[PDB]
């Protein structure tokens, strides 16, 4: 019969239930005082039903009230909160083009000719095209699913043919767009919201981060400030110019779009610094993407960097306790956490730090009762062989510039 308000620690309105006694005391002193409220009687059943109804009403009202704040909301409810700050809900798409097709003679490469690459391609042809007598044609293609896809630059497999066409292929000139996907970012919208809490603003580090994150296919952004302009190094990454903003962008987005958004969030007259050699990977060496000022005048230059790619490994030893066999769900849990699908714990981002305790925590998240014993991690550069068992330690610093990535096969799980 009460609404508990967790003022600061849980920020939740919680029902207290225990309303049956209140319903009984309401029936008393209104229908008299000698009413036999015992069960197996009509009035007892009435009181039980009324108490159930009112517990249900309290629960529903508590849930609706709690939907106002994030970390407890869900679809179309957390999204009112996101749209309050303009954090867009977000769509899906899939379309490619330019895919070459080496074939026989005058083959009718008809629409929706099914093709497939390594990661379950399922690629159709947009419109039917007839092979030219030379034997080399280019078709436009779309992807069956609506997920962010990376097609390999080598033709892999085709489904539908008249047995005359040899194979399709992907060339460097082919136009590939990595597409956005609904939300998939459903639990990690809560993560992305804190980062993009200032999309509607401009001319600030947080606004720049929010807008560049809003650019499609930008998994993570790191933006530094140079408030103290004396060259030096501020929050990592050496700073050539005194006042400048250093931007590191992950993912595989389009340079023109990212640079246009970076220009749109410009901050007046603060330059762009991406030097210090090894600090990040320069996008275009000197003289980065030019872009055009919407206030028509001049052609400026927007400078940012891409992170240093790292390959991580995870050695886990678990007891398989509590009588629940689990052979290869552990690496799935680890890769989920690293990709950032989990709620509240953004995974391996441009500013991350590969932690053995964090990995063991994610494993204990997704599947408790296995008694993780050792969770050594280590990591190496993008290439290079395995770092050998001697390098597997409990932590990696993973400085502000760079980006780690954990493969499905880079996790080895052993039962003790």
């Amino acid at each position: 019969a009460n609404y508990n308000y967790i003022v600061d620690t849980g920020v939740i309105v919680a029902d207290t239930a225990d309303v049956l006694s209140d319903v009984e005391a309401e029936f008393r002193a209104a229908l008299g005082a000698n009413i036999n409220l015992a069960a197996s009687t009509p009035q007892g059943s009435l009181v039980a039903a009324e108490a159930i109804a009112r517990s249900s009403v309290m629960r529903n009202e508590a849930r609706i009230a709690n939907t106002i704040n994030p970390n407890v909301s869900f679809g179309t409810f957390l999204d009112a909160i996101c749209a309050l700050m303009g954090i867009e809900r977000g769509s899906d798409l899939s379309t490619f083009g330019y895919g070459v097709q080496v074939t026989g003679r005058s083959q009718t490469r008809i629409s929706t000719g099914s093709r497939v690459q390594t990661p379950a391609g399922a690629i159709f042809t947009v419109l039917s095209d007839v092979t030219i007598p030379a034997g080399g044609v280019a078709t436009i293609d779309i992807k069956s699913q609506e997920y962010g896809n990376i097609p390999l630059p080598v033709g892999n497999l085709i489904i539908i043919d008249g047995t005359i066409g040899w194979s399709g292929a992907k060339v460097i000139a082919s136009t590939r767009v990595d597409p956005g996907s609904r939300q998939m970012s459903d639990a990690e919208l809560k993560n992305a919201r804190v980062n993009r809490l200032a999309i509607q603003g401009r001319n600030s580090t947080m606004a720049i981060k929010a807008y560049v994150s809003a650019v499609p296919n930008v998994t993570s952004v790191n933006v530094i400030e140079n408030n103290t302009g004396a060259v030096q190094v501020v929050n990592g990454v050496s700073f050539t110019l005194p006042y400048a903003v250093w931007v590191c962008v992950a993912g595989n987005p389009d340079k023109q779009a990212v640079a246009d958004a970076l220009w749109a969030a410009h901050n007046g007259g603060t330059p762009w610094d991406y030097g210090a050699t090894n600090n990040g990977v320069p996008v275009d060496g000197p003289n980065g993407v030019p872009v055009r000022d919407p206030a028509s005048g001049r052609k400026y230059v927007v400078k940012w960097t891409t992170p240093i790619m790292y390959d991580g490994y995870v050695n886990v030893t678990v007891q398989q306790g509590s009588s629940s066999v689990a052979p290869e769900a552990i690496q799935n849990a680890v890769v989920n956490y690293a990709q950032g699908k989990v709620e509240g714990e953004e995974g391996l981002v441009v500013g991350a730090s590969l932690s053995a305790f964090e990995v063991a925590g994610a494993i204990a998240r997704e599947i408790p009762g296995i008694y993780i014993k050792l969770c050594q991690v280590a990591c190496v550069a993008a290439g290079s062989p395995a770092p050998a068992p001697g390098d597997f330690t409990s932590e990696y610093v993973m400085s502000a510039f760079g980006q780690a990535t954990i493969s499905v096969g880079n996790v080895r799980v052993t039962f003790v």
Partner: protein
């Protein structure tokens, strides 16, 4: 822009093929406003969308993207004046994009 006929009924459900998609809008009077349950191709899209004049019914992007379209009320929804005075209009992808560009700089 397609005008969807209405009926001066406090609670109704209109079912139609618009924009290469099959829409079903259930408009009902809720307290002192109108709410709409919108479903496309059978699966539900939104429930209890508070309805106003000029504001698209499908608000969030993934509901009207890609090029799915949207529904707009000329005035504040009121079933007493439905059909003669208040009309609901359907915009395809391009028309809704142009409307959004117009209404994002009012």
């Amino acid at each position: 822009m397609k005008k969807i006929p209405l009926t001066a009924v406090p609670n109704q459900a209109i079912s139609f093929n618009a924009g290469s998609s099959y829409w079903k809008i259930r408009l009902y009077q809720n307290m002192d406003m109108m709410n709409a349950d919108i479903s496309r191709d059978g699966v539900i899209v939104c429930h209890g969308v508070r309805c106003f004049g000029g504001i698209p019914l499908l608000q969030y992007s993934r509901q009207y993207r890609p090029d799915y379209g949207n529904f707009v009320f000329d005035r504040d929804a009121d079933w007493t004046l439905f059909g003669d005075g208040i009309n609901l209009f359907y915009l395809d992808g391009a028309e809704f994009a142009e409307y959004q560009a117009l209404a994002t700089r009012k």
